[PDB]
Amino acid sequence: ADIQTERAYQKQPTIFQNKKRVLLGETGKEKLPRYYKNIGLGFKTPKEAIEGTYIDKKCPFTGNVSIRGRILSGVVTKMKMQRTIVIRRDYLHYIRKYNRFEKRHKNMSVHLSPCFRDVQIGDIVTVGECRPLSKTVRFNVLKVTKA
C-alpha cells in the first residue's frame, strides 16, 4: 500500500483499527484515528504529523521515542539513508599555549521523521537527545530552519 512497504503489517500500537461499524458510517467514509503526542520543550508538532499516513516507530511525535537530555543543532550534509541523515557540527577548540583556536567538526547520524518532507541539504536543524535507536543514532530531528 502507500504506507505498506514491508513483509510485516505497519500500524501504530496504541491505535485499534477493527471497531464494529454500522453501514451508515462504513459506506460514508474510511479514516483510521492518527495518534500523536506533544514533546515538552516548547516544540509545536508539525501539521503533516497529525494529518499524515506515514508509520514510523522512531518518530518523536508519532512513535515510542521520549525526548530527554541535550538539545543541539547541526547542518545537513548527507540525506542518503532511510529516514536518517548525517549532520555536521562545527566548533573552535581553544589552545592556551598559543592563546589561539582551531576549528573542528563532528558528523553524527540523526533520525529524520518522514513528516519533515521537502527538506534540502545545507539548512540548519535542531535535534533532541533520545534513547539509542541504532548502533550510531542517539539524536532525533525536532525542527528545521531554512538557509
Binding site: 505498506q4 500500524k11 483499527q17 477493527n18
Partner: protein, 205 residues
C-alpha cells in the same frame, strides 16, 4: 559463551577496536528457544537479579482475543502459516512474536451462539445435533426476547471471517514472546491486516 557486547564490533569510522577487558557475565546470551507445536514442555532459566524466565520448548494451547466485540478464549494452536522475519520458521513450525498462526474456532463460535443465537460456520443443511437447539431456538421471557432482539442489529460479522468459521479455524498473530514469557498469547487477525496477510499467504506459494 554467547556475548551481546558492543566492543567486538568495528567503530562507526570503520577501524578495528582492541578489547581492554575479556567477556563479563552480564554480557552473556543463551541459545534460541526454537518453540515447536506440541504438548506443553516449558523449562525455566535463572537470570540476573535471581529472577526466573520461562523458556517454552513446545507449546500446544494459548489464549487469543476477539477485539471487535472484546472476548478472549483459551484455544489449541493448529499450525504456523506465515512469518514476516524469515521463511525457514514457516517450514520448521517455530512460534515467535508477530508470526501468523491458524488456531481452532470452537470457543468463539460457542460464545457467539450463547451470546446472540445466530449460526456461524454452519452450512445450509447440517442437522442440529441435540444440544445446540436449547441455545439457537430456546424459549425465554419476553424481556430477554426483546433484550436479544436489540442485540440482533449489532451482531453482523465481516465476510472475511465467515469462510474461516465455515472451515472451523481462525488466522491469529502472536503478541507474547513464548521464549521469554513462556506462553503463546496474541489476537485473531481482522479487517485490513487480515486481507494483507491473506494475499501475502496466497502469494507465498
Amino acid at each position: 559463551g554467547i556475548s551481546r557486547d558492543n566492543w567486538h564490533k568495528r567503530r562507526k569510522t570503520g577501524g578495528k577496536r582492541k578489547p581492554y577487558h575479556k567477556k563479563r557475565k552480564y554480557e552473556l546470551g543463551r541459545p534460541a528457544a526454537n518453540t515447536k507445536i506440541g504438548p506443553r514442555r516449558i523449562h525455566t532459566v535463572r537470570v540476573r537479579g535471581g529472577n526466573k524466565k520461562y523458556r517454552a520448548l513446545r507449546l500446544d494451547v494459548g489464549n487469543f482475543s476477539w477485539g471487535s466485540e472484546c472476548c478472549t478464549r483459551k484455544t489449541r494452536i493448529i499450525d504456523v502459516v506465515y512469518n514476516a522475519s524469515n521463511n525457514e520458521l514457516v517450514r520448521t513450525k517455530t512460534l515467535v512474536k508477530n508470526c501468523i498462526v491458524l488456531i481452532d474456532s470452537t470457543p468463539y463460535r460457542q460464545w457467539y451462539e450463547s451470546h446472540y443465537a445466530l449460526p456461524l460456520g454452519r452450512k445450509k443443511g447440517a442437522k442440529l445435533t441435540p444440544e445446540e437447539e436449547e441455545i439457537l431456538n430456546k424459549k425465554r421471557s419476553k424481556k430477554i426476547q426483546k433484550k436479544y432482539d436489540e442485540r440482533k442489529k449489532n451482531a453482523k460479522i465481516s465476510s472475511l471471517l465467515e469462510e474461516q468459521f465455515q472451515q472451523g479455524k481462525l488466522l491469529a498473530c502472536i503478541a507474547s514472546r513464548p521464549g521469554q514469557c513462556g506462553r503463546a498469547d496474541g489476537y485473531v487477525l481482522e479487517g485490513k491486516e487480515l486481507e494483507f496477510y491473506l494475499r501475502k499467504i496466497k502469494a507465498r506459494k
